[PDB]
């Protein structure tokens, strides 16, 4: 079995990507944030307190002939940004881009945090981390990917995120027409339940590649690229009039500027993020300041290769019993 679904940025800034998901019978189509940095499938629902739903489309279990209440199971999750939600749990049919899974644990939100209520475009999250992170209790539930694994042509999914443009989540196969060169595979640690890997270093612009280990997670639901302070200071040093701003909370630079590329290594391979990717956009509309697309991980406590990194790459999540991460230039 395979699936293939278009994923689209929710705004002109590429803050996040949404992908339509089909839940229930007959099918209820919601727009979910595919999040390789968590492992809960959660949605706005019939059950969600009314004054907390805000333009979002909801999943009504009672209109699905194939939904079933998972007796005594509840969940509660929070994200690095401080947002949260909680509720109880249905099993149901879930289809992504052709690929269907029966008895997928569909977590129904009874309450959502104010952040979610303001985000009109996001109808919930589909988590693609390891199942060890699932919040359901007393027994943890499998992700979409875990459940699909047996029927997939290959235990893998690939993320092809676009730079101000839709792209592609693929399940069960690697599309050779989508990248250039060859995929470079690197080892994953599952010890924290993340897609966690060790980058072999970095270069800024046209200068020298420093081999230094960067431990980091590949996280499709994190907008920016967060790296050790001293790496980040190295980058923005090449942008004159770049400075760190307390007020706006990170490095800011003149929209005027041509930003240098950033290169990060994967084994012996090099992936290069074009300067234009790191120009996130103006801090307010009309401003001559833009917010920087690479920022310090120091306050997060883990390095995150989020959307700014990943969209420069064709990325293969390899879900074999020993999982690997593949990067290719595209």
Swiss-Prot record:
Keyword Cytoplasm: no
Protein keywords: Aspartyl protease, Disulfide bond, Hydrolase, Protease, Signal, Zymogen
Active site: 35, 199
Entry EC number(s): 3.4.23.22
Keyword presence, Glycoprotein: no
Residues annotated as domain Peptidase A1: 17-328
Disulfide bonds: 255-290
BP terms from Gene Ontology: proteolysis
Superkingdom of the organism of origin: Eukaryota
Catalytic activity: Hydrolysis of proteins with specificity similar to that of pepsin A, prefers hydrophobic residues at P1 and P1', but does not cleave 14-Ala-|-Leu-15 in the B chain of insulin or Z-Glu-Tyr. Clots milk
One annotated GO molecular function: aspartic-type endopeptidase activity
Family: Belongs to the peptidase A1 family.
Protein name: Endothiapepsin
Source organism (scientific name): Cryphonectria parasitica (Chestnut blight fungus)
Gene this protein is translated from: EAPA
Shown part of the complete sequence: 90 to 419 of 419
